[PDB]
Design a protein around this ligand. Structure first.
Ligand SMILES: NC(=O)c1ccc[n+]([C@@H]2O[C@H](COP(=O)([O-])OP(=O)(O)OC[C@H]3O[C@@H](n4cnc5c(N)ncnc54)[C@H](OP(=O)(O)O)[C@@H]3O)[C@@H](O)[C@H]2O)c1
Ligand SMILES: NC(=O)c1ccc[n+]([C@@H]2O[C@H](COP(=O)([O-])OP(=O)(O)OC[C@H]3O[C@@H](n4cnc5c(N)ncnc54)[C@H](OP(=O)(O)O)[C@@H]3O)[C@@H](O)[C@H]2O)c1
Lengths: 334, 334
């Protein structure tokens, strides 16, 4: 039986995209079908339709790493915890931007109270990655200085708040004064405009010459020279981007050895199910309750713009021009 | 109050080395004076007299990173398990290749029963580093596939054995068939001659395409591509040498991020006393007793050649020619 979903015949630019009737999936041993209300764009969706990000073997080849909606159907061998009608959000390897999606019941998360389904669609990928990067990969401690690159993005806007909730001191880099000001309102200790100034020196000045203890790098090759200088002794330098590189050309080994540094790379989409549940399980204890605490310390999902699925084309152009300040959510017709 | 010591007037070649009368040092709060019976050459010593390596602020600017001998004298504030006349060995920041050396008693280790003071002179720097890199930095687990570059070096010949004791599988790379054969007898699961073959394709072949879980890289630049290729998913890549480079010139970030890798750099000499005391204590408990167990599983310190201090000049030409197969010990006239 049929189903509307985001699609592209051939890999190319954003103009190739359209909504198409594809086959409606079905559950299968410990998973549930989710009637999607709204999904969210991520940078991985851009690369995929250009061809540079194929989904892991078996996972659906259709854009959407996260989704929010209602429980449509139960699969064989479930817990019975989730029931048909319950609201939920999930982390996906694909198939997020389609009316229905098949989701293992482990990776399914409840919606915080006082949040719209459109709002809850902005949580999964951005905050689960942020939480992974900060706590599991980085082991952020109370006192650590943190350098968040592309801080006014999906993951970055989440990272500023989790770093503040972890009791660390976040430092941001972005390409606009308008963005840095929003970064400040998210509890950023300092914000630097990389197009205006050298963030390495700014960071060394802010940390009184000590440097940062943790770097959440998602730029890569254009930043490596600068990242190593402002990295403190024994500092962790978490890599997960390559938006501004992938290639290295210089004495990285020499300088990273001098700072006694550690270059820990990290991925999420490519992980196994045992790992993904463990992350979602850790996240639902440590982080999820604070989306509906009250105000003073309440985590706010940053929404820039909401588009319908029929304007998926115009949404990709908006992300590629770097205009978004937080998440950019798509609504699927129900 | 004079004392014979290895010295060089200006930084240059090995011909600048000779033995000179220097002022004899004195203890000072929680340390002892060790009457040196033997020391050992390390790669650090070569770089130091070329000018590249400097000793850490305060520490003595006289060659020798390790020593073995009798506790000549007690300094103030000693805890007093050690007594004058006790034979011991020590990890130093410098001053090891001279008749007397000042040593904090926290870094003082007992000599295994049966071993000559000359043999004990090979243990500290090589094995403490090997142990550091394997356990503390690298977190070796039983079953892991460990790739040890320059495996027939001071650090190497120790690493092979500790890796084996850890229940791990050591794979070695050296530049000579004669050397590889010695690696085998030390328990190397496989040996590769890099001057004859590609170790990246050999390593993968051995690991059934899976790749190595841990790398003890002390070559650096010239090996970076071949290391990233043969590294496994979530593999650790400990960097501690840069003998064959220091510069990178390709898509390192792209490939490391695919393997979800960790590039952990490590140094020993530059560290504070707290870390050094913690490390030597872990070593004495876990490792040291096995230097005198019985036979089957016994740890063997490997000595290539012994030189007297007067022939220091000759010893440096030997190491710089890469001829040594294990440690290379210097004996001091007492
Ligand atoms: N590790 C994982 O499993 C995983 C999962 C999710 C996301 N990610 C990564 O997280 C990053 C952000 O993802 P997202 O979905 O949040 O994207 P996003 O919302 O579109 O944000 C990306 C931002 O980065 C900045 N930027 C783009 N190119 C840059 C460059 N060359 N140099 C410096 N800044 C640049 C842009 O703003 P300004 O330049 O104006 O500051 C842009 O707004 C991506 O690199 C993505 O690959 C990784
Ligand atoms: N983290 C620390 O504080 C620390 C502590 C101790 C040692 N280290 C490092 O460990 C390394 C070895 O120390 P060591 O004193 O044991 O050295 P060593 O005994 O003199 O042996 C070095 C061996 O490495 C091989 N080699 C030399 N140059 C090479 C190159 N360009 N490419 C590939 N192989 C090369 C040579 O054998 P083949 O060519 O035959 O293979 C040589 O015999 C040094 O780089 C040193 O800096 C670091």
């Amino acid at each position: 039986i049929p189903m509307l979903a985001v699609h592209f015949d051939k890999p190319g630019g954003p103009e190739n995209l359209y909504v198409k009737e594809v086959a409606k999936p079905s559950p299968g041993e410990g998973e549930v079908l989710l009637k999607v209300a709204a999904s969210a764009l991520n940078r991985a969706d851009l690369m995929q339709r250009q061809g540079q990000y194929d989904p892991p073997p078996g996972a659906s080849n259709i854009l959407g790493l996260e989704a929010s909606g209602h429980v449509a159907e139960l699969g064989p061998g479930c817990q019975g915890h989730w029931k048909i009608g319950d609201t939920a959000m999930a982390l996906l390897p694909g198939g997020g931007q389609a009316q229905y999606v098949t989701v293992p019941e482990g990776l399914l998360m409840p919606i915080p109270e006082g949040l719209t389904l459109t709002q809850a669609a902005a949580i999964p990928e951005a905050w689960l990655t942020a939480f992974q990067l900060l706590h599991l990969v980085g082991n952020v401690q109370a006192g650590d200085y943190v350098l968040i690159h592309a801080g006014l993005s999906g993951v970055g806007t989440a990272a500023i708040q989790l770093t503040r909730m972890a009791g660390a001191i976040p430092l941001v880099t972005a390409g606009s004064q308008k963005k840095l000001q929003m970064a400040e309102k998210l509890g950023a200790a300092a914000g630097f405009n990389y197009k205006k100034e050298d963030f390495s020196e700014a960071t060394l000045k802010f940390t009184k010459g000590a440097g940062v203890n943790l770097i959440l790098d998602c730029i890569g090759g254009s930043y490596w020279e600068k990242n190593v200088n402002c990295l403190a002794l024994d500092g962790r330098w978490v890599l997960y981007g390559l938006m501004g590189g992938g290639d290295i050309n210089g004495p990285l080994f020499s300088k990273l050895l001098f700072k006694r540094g550690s270059l820990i790379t990290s991925l999420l989409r490519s992980r196994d199910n045992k790992y993904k549940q463990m992350l979602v399980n850790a996240f639902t204890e440590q982080i999820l309750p604070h989306f509906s605490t009250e105000g003073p310390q309440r985590l706010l999902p940053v929404l820039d713009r909401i588009y319908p699925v029929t304007e998926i084309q115009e949404a990709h152009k908006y992300m590629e021009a770097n205009k978004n300040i937080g998440k950019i959510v798509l609504e699927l017709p129900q």
